[PDB]
Design a protein around this ligand. Structure first.
Ligand code: G1P
Ligand code: GLC
Ligand code: NA
Ligand code: NA
Lengths: 479, 479, 479
C-alpha cells in the first residue's frame, strides 16, 4: 500500500545536475511536502529523454549510481518507468540480434514485420502512428541481410514481442531488479502499444490487453510493487485498469480543469469527480504536455475545440496522431505543447485553484517539477534541442530552484502540498458537495478530521477550512 | 443647451504635448469645423489613462492649467469626464480614510464589504465586474487594521458609496467646480456600477440607477450643464437614458455601420435609424475601440460574428468579457481593438461615407481625433506601453497633425465637418428616405434649408445635395 | 482543328528570361509530351500581368519578337489571348480619343457613361463587378473636358463598345493579325463583360452574349482558328459555349478533384464526368487562383466549404467577390490563391492521381507550368510586388527547370503527359466505368486502342493499363 501523499515528477539531471542535487533539493524544500517521487527514466538511453533504455538494471553514470536512488527509498515512495513496449537498439539483447541473425537466443524478443506477410492498405489505416513514418524499421544484419522490425517511436526504440515468451521473461527480470532497489510503483510506459494483431488497431487490443496487464500486475505483486499503466485514450480504459487493482492515470483532469477555470464552468468537472475511477494517480502537468483524447466524453467535443483554440496562442505546435497517410495527414490533436501554468495564462490564483482541486480529487496527486516551480514555456530550450516537448522540460539549477521556490505562488503551492501530505482527513472518504454551475465544493472526512475546498471559478478563489483536532475548532488554511 | 455641431474627442497631451498645443491645433484647422470638444480626463490621476482622478478640481500640470481649459470655453462647447463611480486612492478623501480609519469624516464615502456579511456564491457570480478578481480591495490602515473596500476597476480606483450621502456631496462639488470653468456636457464615466445591491448584478440595477441619474441631471441643470452617461450594454438602456432628458451614446452605430459598409447591407442600419434614441451623441470611434454588446439586438448575432471575424485580421487582441473561453464568439468579445479607419480596410470612400451617415444620424456627432486624422493602428505604441487600447491612441506632434490634415481623405472629412457644423438643415427634423437593401438615403429639413445624403453601400459612394437659401438652387457638396 | 494533346500554359518571361529560353526549355524536355502552348499575354502592356494590351499586333521587346513566336508554330498548337473586352489606355486608338475628343474617328469604340443618362441605384447594384468602385473612369481630355468611360478592371483597361461598329473591326483586325502568325486557338479573355445594358448584370447578358460570341467564332474560323472563351460563373454557361462550336473551360474540375481527393469522394466527380460538357479545355491550375463559383452546383455547398476549410491553411488570402463581409462562406470566395501542388499538401501520389483524372477527362488538357514543375507557394514573390496571385506565378531559370524535371513526382507527371499526347485511344470515345463511391474508373477506346485508369481516392493510388498495339498485350503504364 502506497503513502497517500503528493508525489514529485522530476528528471534526474534537470533539477541541479544529477541525482544527488535532486535529493539535496528535496530535503531542503519538500522534506514534509511529498511522500514519494516519480524519477523519470534514469537508465542508459540513446533517444527520447531516457525512454530508450539499453537495460533497466544500470544507472547512467552521468546521473549517479543505484546508491543515489536508494537514498530516496528510506523516506519516500519510489515510482519508476518500465518501458514494457520497447528497449533500445543498443541494448545487449538487440545487439545480439544484429550479430547472430535469427539464430540469436533473443530473436523471438522482437516483433518481425515479416511474420504477418502482406498487410493490406485497409489494415494499415487502422494503426495510428506516433512519428511521420510507418512503424517499421529496416535494419542491416552483420551478415548483410536486410529485415524489418516493428518500431512505434523513434528508430532507436525497438518494440518487444508479447506474442512470444522472451519479452515476459525480460520484464519480470527487470521488475525483480527494480523492486529490490526500493521501487514501489511501476509506471508501465506506453502499455497500450504492446498488443499487436494485424486486422486490429494494434493499440489497446482487447482482450489481449487485459491478459498482458493482469500478468505484469501479478508479477509486480510478488516483488512488493503496484502498477501505474500509462494509456492516453478514452477514459473508459482508465476504468478498466482501475477495476483490475491497478492505478489509472487521471489524465482527464488536466484538460477538464483548463476548461473549467477558463470558462467558469463546474458542470462537467463535477460530473467527472462524481464518477472518476478510484485508486488513480492524479496529475495536472506531466513530462509530455496536456493530452486531449483523455478527456473525450468527460468534456463535450465542442468544448474540447474551445479548449484547444484557447491554448493555441499560448502553445507551440501540437503533437499529433496519424495513420497510413503519415507524411501530411494533419491528424488528431494529441498533446498541447505547453506548461500547465501558461495554459492558465500564468494566473496565480487560477493555478493554485487547479492544484487545490487536484489534491482533493480521489487518488494520489503527482506534481510535476516544472509545475511545482510555476515554470513558463521554455522557448529557448525547445529551439536549441528541436524536441517539441522540451518546452515543458525546463532545466533548473540549484540557484534557479531556490529563487523560484520563493515566488509567492510557489509558497502557496507548498502550503497545499504540506496540507495534502499530512492532514489525515484525506485518508478517509471523499464526499462531493452541491454547488452552482460555476464553483466546486469538495470535502474529505476521516473521523473528526475534516477538510473542505471551495473554488469559485468566476474569480479563481480558493478556500480550505479544516478541523484542528487538537483544539476542535475550524481554521482557515492560509494559502 | 449644446451646439448642434461636430464635437472633437481628444486627449490633453496627444496632439502636441499639452492643452495649449491642442488649442493651437484646433484654431489652425478646426475653428469652423467643430462646436465643442470632449477632452479626455485631464485631472491628477494614477491609473487607467486618466480615469483615476485624485480630484476633479485640479489640472495635471503636465497638461496645463485651468486657464488652458477656459481658452476653449469661449468659442466651443466643453465635454469633460465625471468619474461618478470611483475616485483615486491617492485622492485627499481616501487618504484620510487610511490615516484616521472609520473615525474619518470621509468614511461613509466608500463601500465597505463587511457591511454585506456573507455573500453566497450565486450572489457573487451575478456581479458584473469583468476582471477575474472579486471587486474587493484589501487596504491596510495607518494603525495596522486591514479592511476591504469595493473596487470595480484597477486597485487605485476606490468605488463610491451612493447608499450614503457623502458621495452625492462630492459629486455636486465636482459638478459645481467643473461648470464654473465652462463645462457644458458632463460625461458620466461608468455610471452603471454606482448601484450596488447584493443579489443583483450590481450593474444598471433598475430602478435605482435612474434615481442616481435623475439626481445628477438635476444637479447638472442647476449649474448649466447636460449629461452624457456612459453605458456599454444593451441599447434598451440608451433609450432609458434618452427618456430622462439625458444624452445617450450612439454606441450601436459603429459596428452597425462597419457591417453595413463591409457587406453592402442597409436593412439593419435603416431599421435602427428609424427608431434610434433621441438626443444622443453619435460616435464611430472613441478612445476605447469598437464595443460589441452595444449592437446586440440591433444587428443579428450571425451578422455580428461576420463583423468580428472580418475585423480579426486587421485588429489587435480583442478586449474580452469574463470567463470567455470561446474567444471567437459574439458573446466573448467586449471591444475590438482597432482604429475605425483600419476597420474599413483604409478605404477612403467607405470612411467618408461612414462619417456622412454619422453626420446625418440624429444627435450630436463626435469625431475622435485619430479618426479625424485618418490614423492607422499604432502597432509600435501598443507594443511600447502594453496598453492594448493604445492601438487607437496615436500620438501626433503638431507637425504630424499639419501633415495629416493635408491627406485627401482628411480634407474630405473636413469638408463634411464644416457642412454638418454650419448648414442649418440639421437644426430641423430628420426624415429618413426609402432605399433598397444596399443603400441609405438620409435628409434633414429646417424651413427653406434642406440637405440629402445618398450612400451606395456597394461602391462606398457619398453624395450630398443641399439647398443654398441665398440663391434657391440645389448644389452638390464637393467632398 | 487542334491536336488532341497536352498543352502547356506558360508566361513568356517566367521560364528562363524570354521567349527564346522558353523555346529552349520546351524542346529540351517537352518536345514530345505536349502538342500546343498557351502563351500568356506577351503584348505591350501596362497593367494586370499583361492583360492591358496597347495592341495585339506587337510583341513587347522585353519578351522577344514575332519570330520568337513563330518558332513554336509548325510543331505546336498556339493559344493566345484576345482581350475582347478592353484595350490599354496607352493604346493608339484610345490616345486619339484623348487628343481630339469626340471628333476622333475612334470615339464610338468606347462606352461613354453619359450616354445612358441617369442610372438608378438598383441598376448600379445589378452590375456584376468584383471591385468596390463604380466601373466608371473619369478621364481628362487634352482640351480640358472631363468625360467618363466604362472601366470594368484596373483603370488602365478601358472597355470596348459592342453597341458600335469600331469594336468589331478591332477584334477582326487583331484576329487576322494573330492567326497570320500561326495562332490556332484564341482565348477570349473576359468576354462576359462585353454585353452592357443598363438594368442588367452587364455580364453574360442573354441572348446578346451569344450574338457577340457566334460572331467572333466565325471570324476566327475564317482565319483558321478556334475559340476558347474564358468565363468564371455557373457551369451552365460552359455548355452554352459548348453548344456553339467553341471550347469551354473545365473550370469545374480543379476544385472538384481537390474535394474528391481530400475527402475520398467520387460521387460528384463521376456525376460530372458522365455529363461534363465536351470539346472543353480541361485545367487543374491556371495563372489565376482556384476558382470557386465555377463548381457551384457541380459540388454541394457543404462540400465546397469542406474544400475551403481544408485549403485555408495552405493558401494565401483568397480573392473575394464584392462586399462579401462573411469571409468563411462559399458565396464569398472567388478564387483560392494557391498553387495546385500545395493544395494537395505536396502529396506526390495525390497530385499525379489528379493529373491522371484530368488527362482522361474528355477535352484538351492544359498543364500550367508551375504544376508542370510541382511548384510550391512562392511566399517571397508574393510579398514583393504585392500581387496576391503571384503566389502561383513562380519564376524559373533554365537551371531551376532542369532541376525540377528531375524530381520524382515531375518524372511521373512527364510520363503521363507523353502517354496522353501520343497514345491514340484518346482520339476515340470516352466511357465511364462503374466504381464505388470512393474511387474512379475511366477508360478510352479508339479502334484497337484501349487505356484504363483506376484511382483509389482513399489511398491516392494511380494505375493505368493500356493495350500496347506494338505487341497486342495489356501493359501497365509505369508512373
Ligand atoms: O505520453 P505518451 O505521448 O502517450 O508516450 C510517452 O511514451 C513514449 C515512449 O517513448 C515517449 O515518447 C514519451 O515517454 C511519451 O510520449
Ligand atoms: O474606469 C472607467 C472605464 O471607462 C472608461 O471610459 C475607460 O474605458 C476605462 O478607463 C474604463 O474601462
Ligand atoms: Na476563471
Ligand atoms: Na462596400
Amino acid at each position: 500500500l502506497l503513502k497517500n501523499a503528493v508525489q514529485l515528477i522530476c528528471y534526474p539531471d534537470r533539477i541541479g545536475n544529477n541525482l544527488t542535487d535532486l535529493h539535496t533539493a528535496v530535503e531542503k524544500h519538500l522534506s514534509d511536502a511529498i511522500g514519494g517521487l516519480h524519477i523519470l527514466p534514469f537508465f542508459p538511453s540513446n533517444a527520447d529523454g531516457g525512454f530508450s533504455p539499453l537495460t533497466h538494471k544500470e544507472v547512467d553514470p552521468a546521473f549517479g549510481t543505484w546508491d543515489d536512488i536508494e537514498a530516496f527509498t528510506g523516506k519516500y515512495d519510489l515510482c519508476v518507468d518500465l518501458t514494457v513496449n520497447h528497449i533500445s537498439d543498443e541494448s545487449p539483447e538487440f545487439r545480439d540480434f544484429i550479430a547472430n541473425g535469427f539464430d540469436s537466443e533473443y530473436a523471438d524478443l522482437f516483433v518481425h514485420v515479416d511474420r504477418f506477410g502482406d498487410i493490406s492498405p485497409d489494415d494499415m489505416a487502422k494503426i495510428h502512428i506516433r512519428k511521420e513514418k510507418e512503424p517499421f524499421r529496416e535494419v542491416t544484419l552483420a551478415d548483410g541481410t536486410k529485415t524489418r522490425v516493428w518500431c512505434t517511436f523513434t528508430e532507436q526504440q525497438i518494440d518487444l514481442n508479447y506474442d512470444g515468451d522472451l519479452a515476459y521473461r525480460l520484464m519480470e527480470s527487470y521488475i525483480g531488479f527494480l523492486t529490490s532497489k526500493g521501487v514501489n510503483l511501476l509506471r508501465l510506459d506506453a502499455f497500450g502499444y504492446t498488443t499487436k494483431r494485424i486486422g486490429t488497431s494494434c493499440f489497446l487490443v482487447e482482450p489481449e490487453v487485459y491478459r498482458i496487464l493482469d500478468w505484469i500486475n501479478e508479477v509486480a505483486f510478488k516483488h512488493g510493487a503496484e502498477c501505474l499503466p500509462e494509456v492516453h485514450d478514452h477514459t473508459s480504459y482508465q476504468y478498466a485498469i482501475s477495476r483490475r487493482n491497478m492505478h489509472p492515470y487521471g489524465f482527464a483532469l488536466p484538460p477538464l480543469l483548463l476548461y473549467s477555470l477558463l470558462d467558469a464552468n463546474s458542470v462537467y468537472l463535477k460530473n467527472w469527480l462524481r464518477m472518476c475511477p478510484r485508486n488513480m494517480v492524479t496529475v495536472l502537468d506531466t513530462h509530455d504536455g496536456i493530452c486531449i483524447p483523455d478527456v473525450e466524453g468527460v468534456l463535450p467535443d465542442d468544448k474540447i475545440k474551445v479548449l484547444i483554440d484557447n491554448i493555441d496562442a499560448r502553445s507551440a505546435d501540437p503533437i499529433m496522431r496519424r495513420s497510413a497517410a503519415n507524411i501530411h495527414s494533419v491528424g488528431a490533436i494529441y498533446q498541447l505543447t505547453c506548461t500547465f501554468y501558461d495554459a492558465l495564462m500564468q494566473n496565480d490564483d487560477a493555478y493554485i485553484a487547479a492544484r487545490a482541486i487536484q489534491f482533493f480529487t480521489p487518488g494520489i496527486p503527482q506534481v510535476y517539477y516544472v509545475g511545482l516551480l510555476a515554470g513558463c514555456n521554455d522557448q529557448e530550450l525547445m529551439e536549441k534541442t528541436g524536441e517539441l516537448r522540451d518546452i515543458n522540460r525546463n532545466y533548473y539549477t540549484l540557484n534557479e530552484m531556490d529563487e523560484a521556490m520563493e515566488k509567492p505562488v510557489v509558497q502557496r503551492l507548498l502550503t497545499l502540498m504540506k496540507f495534502r501530505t499530512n492532514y489525515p482527513a484525506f485518508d478517509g472518504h471523499f464526499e462531493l458537495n452541491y454547488s452552482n454551475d460555476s464553483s466546486v465544493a469538495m470535502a474529505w472526512r476521516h473521523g473528526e478530521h475534516y477538510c473542505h475546498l471551495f473554488v469559485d471559478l468566476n474569480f479563481n478563489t480558493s478556500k480550505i477550512q479544516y478541523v484542528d483536532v487538537k483544539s476542535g475548532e475550524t481554521r482557515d488554511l492560509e494559502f
